């Protein structure tokens, strides 16, 4: 089982499955095993990783999909991160 490390601007290290990380087109182009995001804080990058899990779990599934939650306080930076990550 392969894993990749995504590091936030504040140095938090997020270890996610390689398959999940390849959800982001930007990340997939850099890997196809450690990426540093000097602009993405941990309160945003932790949510990016939750989205990878949510996407892999519910894509091509007929079990009722729940809403992906986003607190008002992270919405703007998560929008900036998502636009750069292409996910």
């Amino acid at each position: 089982m392969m894993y990749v490390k995504l590091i936030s601007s504040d140095g938090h290290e997020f270890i996610v499955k390689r398959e999940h990380a390849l959800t982001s087109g930007t990340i997939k182009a850099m890997l196809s095993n450690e990426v540093n995001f000097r602009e993405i804080p941990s309160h945003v990058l932790s949510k990016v990783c939750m989205y990878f899990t949510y996407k892999v779990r519910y894509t091509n599934s007929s079990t009722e999909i729940p809403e992906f939650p986003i607190a008002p306080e992270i919405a703007l930076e998560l929008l900036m991160a998502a636009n750069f990550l292409d996910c």
């Binding site: 949510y54 999909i65 998502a82």
Partner: protein, 146 residues
């Protein structure tokens, strides 16, 4: 082009809202013009009378976000078997993170204030580009041709 066919052949359907959104069923009339039908609260189902060859799409009733019906965009009522109505299972798509983020930001900011956000020029154009059944019908029609 994308319109309901006037078959006059009855078809019993169940609009089943398996999503957390208030759903707006939209029927494409015989001219291709979208026609709104009564909303469906989250987690509810309605037995409706439709016809074979009719076209339907489902949206979030307040924001117009695109929803899925039987894993696709359009639902077309068909012939029933032994009194079985046709289920139209309406679900949330797995939206992109970007689109999900645009939805949340549109729900918190008044449209006159989008340009007052501290973001790149491109993200203003994405925010301003509200979900629209007419624009989506244009996209579907173009994608059907090629």
């Amino acid at each position: 082009v994308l319109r309901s066919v006037n078959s006059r052949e009855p078809s019993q359907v169940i609009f089943c809202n398996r999503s957390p959104r208030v759903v707006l069923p939209v029927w494409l009339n015989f001219d291709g013009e979208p026609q709104p039908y009564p909303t469906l609260p989250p987690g509810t189902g309605r037995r409706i009378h439709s016809y074979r060859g009719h076209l339907w799409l489902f949206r979030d009733a307040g924001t117009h976000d695109g929803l899925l019906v039987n894993q696709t965009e359009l639902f077309v009522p068909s012939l029933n078997v032994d009194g079985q109505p046709i289920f139209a299972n309406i679900t949330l798509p797995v939206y992109t993170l970007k689109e999900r983020c645009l939805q949340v930001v549109r729900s918190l900011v008044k449209p006159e204030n989008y340009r007052r956000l501290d973001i790149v020029r491109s993200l203003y154009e994405d925010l301003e580009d509200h979900p629209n059944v007419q624009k989506d019908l244009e996209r579907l029609t173009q994608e059907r041709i090629a």
